[PDB]
Design a protein around this ligand. Structure first.
Ligand SMILES: O=c1ccn2c(n1)O[C@H]1[C@H](O)[C@@H](CO)O[C@H]12
Ligand SMILES: O=c1ccn2c(n1)O[C@H]1[C@H](O)[C@@H](CO)O[C@H]12
Ligand SMILES: [K+]
Ligand SMILES: [K+]
Ligand SMILES: [K+]
Lengths: 251, 250, 247, 247, 239, 252
C-alpha cells in the first residue's frame, strides 16, 4: 500500500505531518529522527528512507533525498502529494571562502543554479530562493546554539567533479563552461558547493512550498589542513541540532 | 566631482555607509525630510542625491531612475564612495488576487527579466536580497503594523510587453512574454517592478547588501482603480518602513 | 495625462509625428531652442518633454533617461501619442583608435547587449535603424561638414562592466564581458552607448522609424572616463537638420 | 580501504575489471550479479551498491547509480578512476510510442539531453551518443534472446514529473518549456523517457569511455506486475549477454 | 590552378577585381556577367561558378554561392582572400507581407538570423546589418531601373521548409521554435524569407567587408531581371 | 517541366521505386559514385543538386548531391523523402583532428556535434544528431569488406569551413569567441574530424522517421605537417565511395 510511486508511503503514514527534514544520506535519517519524540521507521526504497517523529506534539517526517536534484525532486514532489508543505534540507558542505572554517554552519539564502532539475519547474530567470520564515528559523536556531554562522549564496552543482572544477579526475579535464568558474564564484561571494539546493529551492519557491537549507562545513578547498574525523562528526551534529530547533519554530 | 554621473565626492557622504534608493528623483527630497538634518547634495540626469542623519549616522538618499541600467550606475558610483548597504523603496502592481492595494511587499529575490543583472553574474546566479536587509524590512513593516507579503518579485526591463500589457500602440507582445503573467502567478510571484533584479544581483555578487520594499498601488487581478488617497498613505507607509529598516542596519 | 509616465496629451503634440529623443532631461530645452516656438510641455521623472516647430511642423523633444527600460517607456507612450519617427541624439564612447572626441557617429545597427530589446523581438532580430532616418542623418552630417563615422554600435545595459570598465568598486567584470571590448573592436564596432539597441529593436519590430546619432566624448582605447571637462552641438545640429528632412 | 571518495572501493576490489553494468536501483545489483559466475558483494554507500562477478573468466562490476544524472556521474567517474572503461546501463522504462509495447526491449543509440549533468562534460551541441560496440552488443544479444527490440532515441529527464510532462501532481502544472513536449518527442520518433542516459552517454562519449543502454518496457504512457518482472529479467539477461561480447 | 580551396580561382584570374556580385544559382552567373563588358568564364567547382566581366573599365566578379549560409561563407571568405572587398547578393525571395507583390524588388537593411553560419562570425547579439553605401547604391539603382522597391528587414532561414514554416512536407511537422513564427515575423514588419543574407551580412559587417542585398519577389506567402539590372547598376556606383 | 519537387527537378517515376539515396556533397561526385553501380543514368541537374539513378543487386538506387552545408542538404533530403526515399547514406571527405587517425583512413559517424543552424529547424539542441543503427552497422561492415582502416565515433559538423573549424589562415585571421580554443576541446573530447553536413542530415532524419548514415574519407590531418597530393586523396575518396555503395547493398 502506497499513495506515491517511489516513496512507498501513504498519507496515513504521515499522521498529519506538514513539515519534513530532508537530508541526502539515507543513513542519517534515523539519527536525525532520534532527536525527536516517538521516532518510527516508515519506509525505505531506493535512496528514499523515511521515518516519522514528533516535535512538541506535532508529527514530523524525516526522509532522505539521495544525491542530486533528480531524486530530490521525486522525494519533494511525493511528500508534497502526501501533505508536506515545509521542507528543511540539512547537509554537510565544502566551503570555497577562506574565512569560513570547518565546523562553521552555512544557511543558504539562495543558490546558483548549476543543475538541470530546477529548470523543470521554472525558467533560469527564476531565483532558487529560500523561504524567509525557514531561513529565519535556521539562522535563529543557529544563534541560540552559539554556532558560528554564515548566511548567503550557495553554488548547487549537478556534478561533484567538473561542476565544482575538480581536476583530479580520470580525464583531468573540465568543460569550457566550468574552467575558471570556482574563482568566479569566490569573487562573487559564493560560500560553498553542494548538489541539491538549487532543485529544492526553485521547485518549492515556484510551487507554494516553503524550503530552507542549512549545512555544516566539514571541508574547505582554500585551506591547507584537512583535518579530521571527530570535528566532522561534531559539526554534523551541530547542523542537526540546528535543523530540529528550526523545525520547531515552523510547526 | 569624484564620480562621473552622480557629481558627488567621498566628502559629501560624511562617512555614510547606507543608501536608500528610490526610483523617482522627486521622491528623494521627501524620504530625506523624514530624517534629521536633510541636505541636498546634487542632481544630475535622473540622479538626485540627498544626505541625512539617522540616529546620528549619515545616510544617503539617491534616486535610481527607472530600470536596471541607471540603477547600476547609481549603485556602482555610490559603492565607489563607500556605500555598502542599499535599500530600495518603490511602488508596485500586485499580480496575486490575495494582495490588496495598500499592502507592503518585501522581496527575498527577483525573477530576472532584465539585462543589466547579466552584466554582473550569469543567469544561474540568484537575484537574492541580503538577509539582514530583508529581516530589517520585515521587522519594520511588522512593528508599524503593515500587512506584509514576503516573497518573489518579477523584475522587468519594460513596463509594457515584459509585464504582458496589450493596451499599447502595437498591441502585440513578443512570443517569450505571451502567457507569462499567468505563469508567474501560478509560480507565486507577488508583483512586477523594474529595478530589483539589477539591484539584488549586482549587490549579492559584489559583497554589497541590498533589500527592497514596495507599496502596492495597483492589482492586475482586481478591477477597481485605486483610491487617490490610499495610494498616498501607502507610499508614505512603505517609506516609513524603509527608514525604520535603515536604522537597524546603521 | 493620456499616458502613464510622460504626463502628456495628444493635444500637447500639436500633430507632431517626429520626436528627437536625448537621454539627459537637462538638454531637451537646449535642443528645443534650436527650432521655432519652443514650449515646455512636462517633466516627470527622467522624462522632460518640449515642443518646437520646424519648417512649420510640430516637433517633440523628449528625454529617455539612461538605458533601454526608460527609453522603452518614452518611445511607447510617445507612439501612443502619435509619434511615428524617433531620432535619438546621444553621447558615446569610441572604441576605434582613429575616432576623435567631437566626431559624429551614425548607427546603422546595434549589438544588443541589453535586455529591453528582447521584450520586443528575439535576439535573432536585428537592432537596425530605419534607412530613411539613417540617410537623413548621413546627408545632414555631410551638410554640416562634421567628421562623421557610420556603422555598428555596441549598446550596453551598463556603463561599467558591460562596456568592460575595470576602474570600479570590484574592479572585476563577469565572464561574458571579459575581453569583449577587444572583440567588438576587431569586428569593426564603432562605439558604446546604452539606448540604441532597445530603441532600434522596438521601433524596427513595431512599424516605427528610428535613427541613431551620437557625439564622441571619450575614446576608450585611451581611457575609461573623460577628464574632461570637456567641453558637440555638431551632433545636435545634425539631428535637427535630419528631422527637417523627415518631416 | 578506498581509492575513491564515494563508492568505498579500491582498485584491488575490481580484480582487473574494465566493464561495469550500471542499474539505478541498489537492490537490483545482487540479482544482476547472480546471473554471472562467482558473484560477490563489494560495498554499499549512499545509493552506491557494488558487486563483482565473472564472465568467461573475466572480472565484471555491477554498481548502482541511484536515480538521476548527478549520482550517476559520481559512480561512473569513480569507477573510471578504478579502471572501468565500458559502462552498460540496464533499466526499466515507460514507452511513449504507440508501437512500443510492454515486454519490448529498447536499445538507446542516443538521448535527448533534458538534464543538467551532461553540460558539466560537454556543451549542448555535443551528442549524448552511445558507443557503437556496446550498442551492437546489446542489439545482437537481444536478437539472440528473441526479444522484440527497438533501437533509437530516448528522452533523458532530470525529473520524473514535469520533465516527462506529468500533470497528476501536487501543483498540477508543468513549466512552459515542457508544456506539449511529450507530443513533440513522440512526433520526433523518440521511444521513451528515463533519467540517467543523457548524463551517462555524454560523460562517456566525451571522455574516451564506452557506454550503452538497454531497458525493458513495463509500461506505455499513451495508454501487470508478473509480466513486468518477466520483462526485466529478460532485459537483464540481455545486458549480461552483451557484456560477454564486450569483455 | 587555384589560390583558394573550393572556388578553383587564382588571384590573377580576378585581374584586380574588388567587387563581386554573388547570385545563388550557378546557372545564373553567365546571364548576369553577360550584361557587362568582356565577360569571360573563370571556373566552375561544386556549386561555385565564377565569371569575370568589366564595368566602366573595372574588373568585376560574378560568383554563385549555392543555397545557404555555409557555402555562401566559403565563397565570400575565398573571394576576400583574392582581394574582393565588396559583395552584392542578388536573389529570389518569398514576400510575407500582403502589400508586397510578386515582381517587386526588395532591398535588405538587416536580417533576422535564423541561420547557423552567422554565429561563426559574431554572437547572436550582433546585427546582420548591410553596409550603408551598398544599401544606398541598391536603392538608388532601383530608381534608375524603375522597379517597385521596398526597403527593410529580411528573415534569413537555414531551411526552405520548416524554418519558413511550411507544413506541406514529408513529416508535416514543424519544430516548436518555428510554430507560429511566420505570423510573428509579419507582425514585426519583416518583408520576406530567404536563405543567405543573415550569413552574408553578419560575416561582412564583422570583418570589414561591404555587403548589399537585393532580391526579386517570386511568390507571396499570404496569397529577377529588374533585380539583376539593379544589382549591376548598383555595382557601377560602388566601383 | 515535370518535377514533383521544387528544387531537384525529379518525379517519382524517375526513382523507379528507389527507397535509398547516396547523398554526397559535390555535384561532380554523383556520376562517379553511380559508376560503382549498375546501369547508371543521369536524372537531373539543377543548382547544386545533380541526381543519377543506378541499380544495386537489381534494385533502384538514387545518388543525389546536397551541395556544401545543412541548408541545401535539408532541401535535398526533404524533397527526396517526398519522392519516396527513406534511407540516406552520406559519403564525404574530411579533415581529421586526432593524431592517431591517418590520411586514407575511413570514418563512420555515430553522431555529430551540432555546430550548424539547420538542425535546430528540426529539433532543439538537446536532441542528438545521431545516425540510424542499421545504416551505421552497414557502413562498418562494408568498411571491413573493403578492408579499410576504420574509426567509428563523433564528428564535429560546422556551418563554416573556416572559423567554425578554428582556422586562422583567413582574410581576417579572426575567430569569434565561441570558437577560440574549440578544436583543442573537441580533440580532448575524442571528436574525430570536422565536416559540414552531418549534423543537419542526422538530426532531420532521426527526428522525422528517416534513416541516415555518414561515412567519410580522411584526405587530411589537421595535426600533421605533410599534406597529400590529389593522387592519394583521390585514392582515399575511392575507398570511402566503395564502402558507401557496399553499405547500401545491405540496406535494400
Ligand atoms: O562611455 C560612454 C559615454 C557616454 N555614454 C555612454 N557610455 O553610455 C550612454 C549613457 O546613456 C550615458 C551615460 O553616461 O551617456 C552615454
Ligand atoms: O522562399 C524563398 C524563395 C526563394 N529563395 C529562398 N527562399 O531562399 C533562397 C535560396 O537561395 C533559394 C532556394 O530556393 O532561392 C531563394
Ligand atoms: K540519487
Ligand atoms: K532611466
Ligand atoms: K550549398
Amino acid at each position: 500500500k502506497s499513495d506515491v510511486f517511489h516513496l512507498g508511503l501513504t498519507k496515513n503514514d504521515l499522521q498529519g505531518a506538514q513539515l519534513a527534514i530532508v537530508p541526502g544520506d539515507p543513513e542519517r535519517v534515523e539519527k536525525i529522527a532520534a532527536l525527536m519524540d516517538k521516532p518510527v521507521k516508515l519506509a525505505s526504497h531506493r535512496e528514499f528512507t523515511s521515518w516519522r517523529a514528533e516535535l512538541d506534539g506535532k508529527a514530523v517526517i524525516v526522509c532522505s533525498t539521495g544525491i542530486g536534484g533528480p531524486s530530490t525532486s521525486i522525494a519533494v514532489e511525493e511528500l508534497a502529494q502526501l501533505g508536506i508543505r515545509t521542507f528543511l534540507r540539512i547537509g554537510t558542505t565544502g566551503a570555497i571562502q577562506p574565512h569560513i572554517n570547518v565546523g562553521d554552519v552555512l544557511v543558504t539564502t539562495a543558490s546558483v543554479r548549476l543543475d538541470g532539475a530546477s529548470l523543470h519547474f521554472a525558467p533560469m530567470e527564476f531565483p532558487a530562493v529560500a523561504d524567509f520564515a525557514c531561513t529565519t528559523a535556521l539562522v535563529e536556531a543557529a544563534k541560540s546554539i552559539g554556532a558560528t554562522t554564515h548566511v548567503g549564496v550557495t553554488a548547487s552543482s549537478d556534478t561533484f567533479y567538473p561542476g565544482q572544477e575538480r581536476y583530479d579526475t580520470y580525464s583531468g579535464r573540465v568543460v569550457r563552461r566550468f574552467k575558471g568558474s570556482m574563482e568566479e564564484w569566490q569573487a562573487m561571494g559564493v560560500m560553498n558547493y553542494e548538489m541539491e539546493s538549487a532543485t529544492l529551492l526553485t521547485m518549492c519557491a515556484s510551487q507554494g512550498l516553503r524550503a530552507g537549507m542549512v549545512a555544516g562545513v566539514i571541508v574547505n578547498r582554500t585551506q591547507q589542513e584537512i583535518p579530521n574525523a571527530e570535528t566532522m562528526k561534531q559539526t554534523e551534529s551541530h547542523a542537526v541540532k540546528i535543523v530540529v530547533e528550526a523545525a520547531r519554530r515552523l510547526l
